């Protein structure tokens, strides 16, 4: 079964209890599915966002059509939509209780792999349609190999080491210099200024 | 507005100043570094063997011919013991000085194809070239003796 597996619209056992839109699941760096597993290529999410069944279908159809099943295999690195998003009836006034469950999404944080590909192939053979999928994804995304991912991580480390700026967001935020924590967020103490809402700034050091 | 927004939320001016101050500064390297200071050997052996074996060598520019015309020329040459050879100039240049052929340097430029043999059928070869008024005979060096085209014609006669 090398081809990418089908993803259901909603979990077979639907959730009955509406739950809050905890945007923290989109905010910040990704702590899961950050490394390669049984594959050599992937789509890396350079930003946070929610993936819908429409996005899943786009990914599945494009990758399945453009891949070579006898030499390439693909695997999801993100679970099927599970978080329920609720919408009220069109034209409803505010109040009257939380809306009914409308759709299911799956959160994705910056730095996560969405799909992972492998097999008897090199990067250039796959990067085309992987980049197409990444560009059509709801968040900033990039087709990345193991080598390219390691290269970008090493480049980030090198920039952090050799930056000539005496002042860094990490240092200022941690020391509360100028009392900037009045303006910053507690999450910023760990984001080090590289994340702003759902957006991840890669050039940011 | 929520902390996470679909758009890039406007930062508080102090946060904007903090980000601008804490932007990455690359290291300036003072003076720009930009303006600071098997097959090959196989054909080496092949060329050495060719030179040692062949008693007479000629060269030409068989590049203006069709595939079939070149094949016919090759067949006519093989009717005699002469063998036509193709080798790159990029690796042929060293061979002249390696085998002590100083006068052969200004002869192998561009397309160059060798006509190595021991028994010269030069008379019939020139007759064949005559009906095709191009592809001139180019200077060669028989048995370590450079011959011009007049020399080849005299030797033929």
């Amino acid at each position: 079964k090398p081809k990418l597996r089908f993803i259901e619209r909603a979990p077979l056992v639907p959730k009955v209890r509406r739950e809050p839109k905890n945007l923290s699941d989109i905010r910040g760096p990704s702590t899961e599915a950050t490394e390669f597993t049984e594959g050599n290529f992937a789509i890396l999410a350079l930003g946070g966002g929610y993936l819908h069944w429409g996005h899943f279908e786009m990914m599945r159809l494009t990758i399945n059509r453009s891949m070579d099943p006898k030499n390439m295999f693909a695997i999801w690195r993100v679970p099927a939509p599970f978080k329920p998003i609720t919408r009220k009836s069109v034209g409803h006034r505010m109040g009257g209780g939380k809306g009914a469950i409308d759709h299911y999404v799956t959160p994705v944080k910056a730095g996560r792999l969405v799909v992972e590909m492998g097999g008897r192939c090199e990067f250039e053979e796959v990067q085309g349609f992987l980049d197409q999928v990444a560009h059509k994804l709801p968040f900033a995304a990039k087709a990345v190999s193991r080598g390219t991912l390691e290269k970008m991580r090493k480049d980030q480390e090198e920039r952090e080491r050799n930056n000539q700026n005496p002042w860094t967001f990490e240092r200022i935020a941690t020391a509360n210099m100028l009392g900037i924590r009045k303006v910053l967020s507690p999450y910023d103490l760990t984001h080090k200024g590289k994340y702003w809402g759902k957006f991840y700034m890669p050039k940011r050091v | 507005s929520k902390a996470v927004t679909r758009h890039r939320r406007v930062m508080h001016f102090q946060r904007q100043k903090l980000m601008a101050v804490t932007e990455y500064i690359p290291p300036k390297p003072a003076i720009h570094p930009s303006c600071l200071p098997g097959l090959i050997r196989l054909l080496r052996r092949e060329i050495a063997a060719v030179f040692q074996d062949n008693r007479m060598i000629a060269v030409c520019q068989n590049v203006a011919l069709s595939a079939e015309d070149k094949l016919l020329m090759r067949h006519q040459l093989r009717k005699h013991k002469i063998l036509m050879k193709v080798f790159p100039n990029q690796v042929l240049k060293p061979f002249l000085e390696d085998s002590k052929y100083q006068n052969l340097l200004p002869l192998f430029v561009g397309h160059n194809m060798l006509l190595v043999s021991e028994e010269p059928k030069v008379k019939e070869m020139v007759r064949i070239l005559r009906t095709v008024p191009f592809l001139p005979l180019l200077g060669g060096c028989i048995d370590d003796t450079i011959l011009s085209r007049q020399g080849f014609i005299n030797y033929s006669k």
Partner: peptide, 23 residues
Amino acid sequence: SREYWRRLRKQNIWRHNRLSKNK
């Protein structure tokens, strides 16, 4: 070895064809 480099050229052509399949 002529056969060695012939096989190397064949493999390089195969790799180029595989890369250009999508291109």
